Amino acid sequence: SNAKELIQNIIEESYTDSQFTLSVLSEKLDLSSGYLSIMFKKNFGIPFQDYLLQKRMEKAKLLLLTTELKNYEIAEQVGFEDVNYFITKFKKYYQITPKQYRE
Amino acid sequence: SNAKELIQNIIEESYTDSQFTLSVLSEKLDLSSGYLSIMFKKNFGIPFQDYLLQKRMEKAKLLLLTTELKNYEIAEQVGFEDVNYFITKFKKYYQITPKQYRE
């Protein structure tokens, strides 16, 4: 699917942007958010928001294991303006905290 | 504090807008997201994004109880970008469905 790969590329380029949302994507694709939400879930098997979260968590994982960056820095680099919100999402995703992930 | 009240009034005026984010609040308070992130959690005990979710869910219940609005309309009116994310967030937040809350 070319349209799936287009969507993949936009997200790969954009996920580090804390202002990147379903609405920004849909606008880039000339679609309503309402239709994109349905079509995304059809094509990828999970909701846009969960896919976006997964890309950010996977990058967070990478930075935690390969750098000495602080949580507030990693949060910023994976599209989170709030370091504590980042920590709460990470803990829900990996079941432990970013600090603990380095232990 | 008057501080907590000021921040609440501002959120109250804006939570309905799906484009309302921590960075918008920062602009309105004239504080960087770096500072606001931490100061908000100190005052409210949870991150801004969680507080924002809370206001939207409470409004969701008021709407469900007092109107015959459908889920897609409610999702729109409480600041979500698409109905499926709204109904999944509602389920997680309350662990019943909007329909179940209305029964």
Report on this model:
- Chain A is an all-alpha fold and 103 residues long.
- Chain A folds into two domains: 1-55, Orthogonal Bundle (Arc Repressor Mutant, subunit A); 56-103, Orthogonal Bundle (Arc Repressor Mutant, subunit A).
- Chain A has helices spanning 2-14, 22-28, 33-44, 48-66, 71-77, 83-94, 98-101.
- In chain A, helix 5 crosses helix 6.
- The radius of gyration of chain A is 14 Å and the shape is elongated.
- The A-B interface holds A 18-19, 21-23, 33-34, 36-38, 41, 47, 49, 72, 81-85, 88 and B 18-19, 21-23, 33-34, 37-38, 41, 47-50, 72, 81-85, 88.
- Chains A, B: It comes from Fusobacterium nucleatum subsp. nucleatum (strain ATCC 25586 / DSM 15643 / BCRC 10681 / CIP 101130 / JCM 8532 / KCTC 2640 / LMG 13131 / VPI 4355).
- Chains A, B: Residues 5-103 form the HTH araC/xylS-type domain.
- Chains A, B: This is DNA-binding response regulator.
- Chains A, B: It is found in: Cytoplasm.
